[PDB]
Enzyme design. Structure first.
Site, PDB file in Angstrom:
ATOM      1  N   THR B   1       0.816  -1.224   0.000  1.00 44.56           N
ATOM      2  CA  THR B   1       0.000   0.000   0.000  1.00 44.56           C
ATOM      3  C   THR B   1       0.839   1.259   0.000  1.00 44.56           C
ATOM      4  O   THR B   1       1.928   1.257   0.527  1.00 44.56           O
ATOM      5  CB  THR B   1      -0.889  -0.018   1.187  1.00 44.56           C
ATOM      6  OG1 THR B   1      -1.647  -1.239   1.139  1.00 44.56           O
ATOM      7  CG2 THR B   1      -1.793   1.211   1.167  1.00 44.56           C
ATOM      8  N   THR B   2       0.348   2.305  -0.662  1.00 41.13           N
ATOM      9  CA  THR B   2       0.919   3.645  -0.594  1.00 41.13           C
ATOM     10  C   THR B   2      -0.236   4.625  -0.762  1.00 41.13           C
ATOM     11  O   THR B   2      -1.034   4.487  -1.670  1.00 41.13           O
ATOM     12  CB  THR B   2       2.030   3.893  -1.660  1.00 41.13           C
ATOM     13  OG1 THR B   2       3.068   2.906  -1.554  1.00 41.13           O
ATOM     14  CG2 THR B   2       2.654   5.243  -1.446  1.00 41.13           C
TER      15      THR B   2
END
Ligand SMILES: *[B]([O])([O])[C]([C][C]([C])[C])[N]C(=O)[C]([C]C1=C2[C]=[C][C]=[C]C2=[C][C]=[C]1)[N]C(=O)N1[C][C]O[C][C]1
Ligand SMILES: *[B]([O])([O])[C]([C][C]([C])[C])[N]C(=O)[C]([C]C1=C2[C]=[C][C]=[C]C2=[C][C]=[C]1)[N]C(=O)N1[C][C]O[C][C]1
Ligand SMILES: *[B]([O])([O])[C]([C][C]([C])[C])[N]C(=O)[C]([C]C1=C2[C]=[C][C]=[C]C2=[C][C]=[C]1)[N]C(=O)N1[C][C]O[C][C]1
Lengths: 220, 222, 220, 220, 220, 220, 222, 222
Positions: B1-2
């Site tokens: 995730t980002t």
């Protein structure tokens, strides 16, 4: 007699307010002015609540001092829960109306008090100072100019209906006030005075002490 | 995730990928990780899916609930505090596995200079928070790579559309290094989502502008 | 005298509602219109509850504002437990009927209020706007066109029984309203107005401010 | 005066029932028919409880809707604790008699309601449909053919004492019903109608909507 | 009769106060003097509270001795929570007014007591000694010079309105006191005497015993 | 009638005291003497409390025996919390006054009792033995010489006002007592006698049995 | 176990095997793993049998309970949320052994396009959920194999009967690899169960059409 | 971290760096670690950020709250006791990770000699406190280096401005040895914050005088 019962409660409270001393708050150039006759040096009728909101009440001390504390309690928690800037004194007026409302019903004897919550715009901001009056039975109203409470108000309030200078000075509004107060009756530097100074950075409250007060006080 | 957040002259942009992984096994390709909390607040959330979604959903309710009750939205300071409390309220859970860290992006309609009303607040597993004031921030498995790419590309930020491309590029850079982030899927037509906030409010950036922007990056790097 | 007792409670409450100001809600083209005479700037008698449902009440403020809060509390929780789309205002009318019902029995003094819960179809959807009236004793009824409450209703409600334009305009229904209001008595841009705008995407509520209001307001 | 006290309670309740609208349930070929005059579109007086058991009541809405919910709560729980097939509506009649019984003693003011619980045999099975009437004071009786409640019952119940066709049709029994209802007084497709269709596989409840209703309704 | 009820409570209490013995406190050079007629050797009407604050009461012993204990309880904990220096006796006066206030409402029978809390400046410091009077109904006032309570006050209080030497001596103020006390009526070394000696380092309390007392006592 | 109500309570209690038997305590050379007329062999009116403190009461047995137990309970705990030496019976008199005080207000029917707490100096020490009388209403006083309670006191107390030998003998004071008791009326070795023997090392209590008693008892 | 769900033009189909194992020891050959929760909702459940049965049973009661109370069925969004809560409310038990994961399939009678009203919602041990929108999903020891076969065979889905065969075939493919899934028992005449939902409602697929379809797969692969 | 406090003839100065680290990874460059608790009290806080921020925030409210209620500020002794209580109230949390130690600096407007009214109170993880009376004190990962430097440079303390330079210099000396403290950032223009308290009250030292003083140290050491 549920209906007749409520009328006795009203009566009892309303009498107590009458035999009590007089308190006045009004809007002026610098913010809001609090003036009340109080011979006592320590038992104060006017107090800070939060940053820009202030408390003043007439009636049975132990009773309003209680509510005062409650207000300070509510405000401080509220502020911590959210942010300082989220306390309104409109809020406090509701809380007070709520509390006094319950009291007038639940408590054996109703509180012999009448309250005034006043707010005045944050530092940089410019907004019309606000005044709220909460009665013993939990009723709440917001006068736009001035609020009178305790003793016989008619002569005190009437004097203001004319002497109220919309955008008065600190020394002018104090003059106007102490004069209008004497109308329902003296008025020496032996009473209680404080202001909500809108010009202050954070805590918009200030008590006006003895010597500094003289330099603004009205000749009788 | 980002999830990534940028501050530009007008306001702020937040954008995050849509990968959801479980082990090293892709289990999601279209997750909406960035939410419009209220009119001026976007909130993005990383970590444990079940908690992330619940944070957002719950937070939004809290804010609008204060508004309907008091008659006025919370201060931005207020909004921050509430989110922080919620995060701390999960520390127990976080300790066991149910970890979830939010990134807050908003436009303070009461800031002195309405050209600096953009805010980015990052959050701490323990309920701490720092108002970023450095223009960019990230959270998630790839936030390290994003932040570092976004370090170089930040000068190019001139306006909304300008910032938005840097955002999408950092997320592209994240996916390029963090196998748990996930870049643009042309074969499937799935692209990072985004939100923009300016004096007019918060708005979902249409995928068109993103998809376009993405292919731009892909070609130029290609 | 259990039976005679209930008669006194009813009396007490019903009088309080009379001496209070007037509030009116009615169905129009765009959804639902809320109009109430209110001198106060802050103490509002009309509020949002949930997405497409709205609140308005006449009577003792501290009392109805309490119920208002409760409504908002109920709706917001219900929404989170299920989905936003599962809150109905038909629900809220129940809740209010239940609460006021209890109060009229359990509380020492019954609430001096009268409530109106109004819902108007979700965005795309088209559905006949709905209006609910809940009385002090917990009684609940749903008028299909308009609801009147507070003060003397007959002259205000009568004026509407004719002036009600089935599918009026925002500016037309407002005219019809403020006029019908004056019948039980003035009516300047110093009152409270808000609408349930069925055309809005999510939150179907909107207050009509000062300047924007004038452009719609009725000549007396 | 404990004895005289109970008579005032009964009085208060029984009057409230009278001033309320009228509701009728009756046994017919397909199962049980529920018909009640109700202008409201949403505030329903007739509801499902469990698989094959149904609810209808006349009186103060907020009060019976409360009991209605309680019934649904009880049934669903009981069903999950044991089996769906173990809920009887004779059970629910007991529970309601119990509740209303306590209320008539414990609560300050007794419920102004009158209830009807109706059961109709499971799908394949064939059994004589059952009707229970629970009064405000907790008394419970089971009529074998039809039940009337709310308003003046004599003219409505009288009309049925003759018009009741033992094994009527759905369109016939509805005709008989709406007619018998008018006797105590109109009766347009603006009321509330639902049936316990014994022919249904599991949930033996069905509301009859607007259009479909007309195709059955009685000429006046 | 809520209003008339409160008058009976006042009355009952007021009478009890009257039939009780007399107690006097006054400000003098050295601090504050406590003098009360008390034939008992152990059942004391005057007590220490905290470092510089003192207690004195007239009325039903078991009642005021209770409040006394509560005071000591309050002060000690308050001191421990913050600092010794943060206890004010203005605080204790509030607490007492709060307590007696509740009692006069909540308790079946109101307390038959009248209280006096007195503070006198810390060691090095010089500040005007303070005196607070708390009545049975929770009312609170601060006399600047002297406080009278118990029995007939008029003749005892009157004698002081003249004999009060602003800055008297220990032996002079004692003289003035016991004399003023006899006015409402003898007065032998068989009573109770203690002082708040402002000159003491920490605990500003001191009881005046038998033999040492004589050396100061007034000839009648 | 709160005022008139308390007068009825007082009445009820004071009558019960009267129709009860008589009990006397007095100070003598060896410490304190307890003498009460009691035909019962087991139901005792005089008991030990702590080391040097003693209990005696007249009135409704089940009531005082309860207070008795409470005393023993209080004393023993207090002793264990601090030291044996820290129990005073002055303390017990307070507690008793507190309890009976509450009872006279809170309990439906007030206690029909009158109590006597007596302490007599520790072994080596020499101190004036102390006597405390606590009445039904929670009032507390300390007689220096003798205490009378139960039945008609005047004739019994009057006989003592003269017969009281300041520093009598055990056999002399018993003589003086039994005689003074008969004045309010016989008085044979069929009653209850015990002493607080100041001469004892630790537990200063001793019951005087049957045979041993005779060798001291007074001829009538 | 394998429970599988398919989205076709008309609506949705869900089918699951009937094996119940304990160790590597067959202890069930006719378990009903797919349930009609209400008129437009089928729910299939994997993992711990005692909990799976109880989830289904309890869930159906909850939905019907809301309906009888408020007079209207829950939103599909509502239905999803309730099942999610229930699953979360088991995290404690799950942690110890009593794990059970549901698959939801339904027809939303309120969807804009009634040809896309078919829904498949997958669920997460912590109460998270993702509306699938990819046409197929599976849960259970063999879901991995099903999903992967059903990836290839998805183009073949034209209508109800068309989808149903792909379902059955995926379940065939699952049992082919997952010894805890269990294929069609010809010797005993036991076959996977299924449910179909379209605008008309939810209906149990008769075993006839299944047994038929199964033999078709067996012969063609044979 | 390093927070440092000095006593000079007029009153007291407290100053602390702005680094926030997480592992050996800079995660903050402008943290405000020194707070003005009320008119005569400054409070600095080291350790776990979430707690430090919350101590300060909460403490200030408590002090102001007593004032508004009783009508008079707490004794300095009172103020110390409250802070101490708060610290003990965190022992549980501190034991697990959430450790935070405050340093108190104030001007007691009631001190006998108004030239000795400056106070430095250090605090103990268990709620213990020692009024320093030695002129200087420090808390934090670099407080050891500070205290030691500040030992030598203490004679130099003559007045406000005089003391303030020694403060800044010790914080410079701290960052020189404690990688978790962080010296002045010229490239970014970030400098330690400070507060001064004398009979007039507590006031934020403007960064100008600090930045200046900093470059003085940098040049002289250079
Ligand atoms: B990402 O970490 O923001 C992203 C989150 C989003 C779904 C809100 N999703 C993840 O990659 C999670 C995966 C995950 C998951 C996957 C499949 C079923 C259920 C499920 C439940 C919770 C989380 N994984 C992940 O990498 N993080 C890394 C650190 O935080 C916790 C797990
Ligand atoms: B399947 O795995 O979902 C299936 C489930 C269904 C029957 C509800 N059943 C199982 O195979 C279980 C076995 C099981 C069981 C077996 C025998 C006696 C009692 C019993 C009670 C509960 C469950 N086994 C299984 O493979 N799973 C794997 C992962 O989840 C927990 C068990
Ligand atoms: B410092 O030690 O006073 C400083 C304090 C300040 C932030 C109030 N802070 C730290 O250096 C912390 C780092 C830290 C942190 C970093 C990044 C995200 C969240 C976060 C939350 C709390 C603290 N590190 C540190 O060195 N200390 C030393 C011992 O105490 C705990 C960690």
């Amino acid at each position: 007699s549920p209906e007749q019962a409520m009328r006795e409660r009203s009566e009892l409270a309303r009498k107590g307010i009458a035999r009590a001393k007089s308190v006045v708050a009004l809007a002026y150039a610098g913010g809001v002015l609090f003036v009340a006759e109080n011979p006592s040096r320590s038992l104060q009728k006017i107090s800070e609540l939060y940053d820009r909101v202030g408390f003043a009440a007439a009636g049975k001390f132990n009773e309003f001092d209680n509510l005062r504390r409650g207000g300070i309690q509510f405000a401080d928690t509220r502020g911590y829960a959210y942010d300082r800037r989220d306390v309104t004194g409109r809020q406090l007026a509701n809380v007070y109306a709520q509390t006094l409302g319950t009291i007038f019903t639940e408590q054996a004897k109703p509180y012999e008090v009448e309250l005034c919550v006043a707010e005045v715009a944050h530092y940089g901001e410019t907004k019309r100072p606000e005044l709220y009056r909460i009665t013993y039975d939990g009723s709440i109203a917001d006068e736009p100019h001035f609020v009178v409470m305790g003793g016989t108000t008619e002569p005190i309030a009437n004097a203001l209906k004319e002497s109220y200078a919309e955008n008065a000075s600190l020394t002018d509004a104090l003059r106007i006030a102490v004069a209008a107060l004497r109308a329902g009756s003296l008025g020496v530097a032996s009473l209680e005075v404080a202001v909500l100074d809108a010009n202050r950075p954070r805590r918009a409250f200030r008590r006006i002490t003895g010597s500094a007060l003289q330099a603004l006080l009205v000749d009788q | 995730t980002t999830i990534v957040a940028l501050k530009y002259p007008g306001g702020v942009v937040m954008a995050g990928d849509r990968r959801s992984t479980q082990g090293n096994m892709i289990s999601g390709r279209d997750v909406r990780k960035v939410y419009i909390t209220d009119d001026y607040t976007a909130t993005g959330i990383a970590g444990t899916a079940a908690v992330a979604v619940e944070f957002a959903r719950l937070y939004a309710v809290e804010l609008e609930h204060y508004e309907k009750l008091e008659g006025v939205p919370l201060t931005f300071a207020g909004k921050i505090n509430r989110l922080a409390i919620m995060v701390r309220g999960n520390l127990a859970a976080a300790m066991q596995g149910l970890l979830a860290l939010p990134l807050l992006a908003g436009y303070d309609i009461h800031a002195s200079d309405p050209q600096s009303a953009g805010r980015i607040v990052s959050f701490d597993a323990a309920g701490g928070w720092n108002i970023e004031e450095e223009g960019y921030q990230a959270v998630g498995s790839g936030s390290l790579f994003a932040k570092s790419s976004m370090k170089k590309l930040y000068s190019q930020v001139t306006d909304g559309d300008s910032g938005l491309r840097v955002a999408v590029e950092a997320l592209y850079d994240a996916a390029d290094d963090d196998s748990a982030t996930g870049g643009p899927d042309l074969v499937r037509g799935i692209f990072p989502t985004a939100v923009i906030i300016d004096a007019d409010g918060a708005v979902d950036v249409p995928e068109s502008r993103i998809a376009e922007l993405a292919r731009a990056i892909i070609e130029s790097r290609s």
